């Protein structure tokens, strides 16, 4: 079962990283295709993906167990814009 979790964090707007979209199966495949189209970093991390999928529903902010693992993702994925 394929899963994809789309995280959004923008300083000043989102008080915490936000799960803005999720998908399983066909929808997960589509999210990944769109990620490629828009050059959004995609990271494979099976334990984290499964746990996020189960715990943090679409439109929910991440919770404490995820703060650091998601921070690490943001640090590698952030576009520094130069």
């Amino acid at each position: 079962t394929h899963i994809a979790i789309c995280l959004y964090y923008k300083l000043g707007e989102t008080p915490l990283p936000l799960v803005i979209e999720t998908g399983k199966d066909a929808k997960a495949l589509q999210i990944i295709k769109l990620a490629e189209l828009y050059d959004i970093p995609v990271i494979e991390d099976i334990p984290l993906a499964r746990s996020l999928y189960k715990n943090i529903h679409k439109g929910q902010y991440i919770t404490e167990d995820f703060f650091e693992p998601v921070a690490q993702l943001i640090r590698i994925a952030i576009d520094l814009d130069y």
């Binding site: 789309c6 828009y38 959004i40």
Partner: peptide
């Protein structure tokens, strides 16, 4: 239509299994 694509376009990172 288009909400999915607009969300992905603005997103920060995707985690997958």
């Amino acid at each position: 239509s288009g909400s999915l694509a607009n969300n992905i376009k603005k997103s920060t990172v995707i985690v997958k299994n």
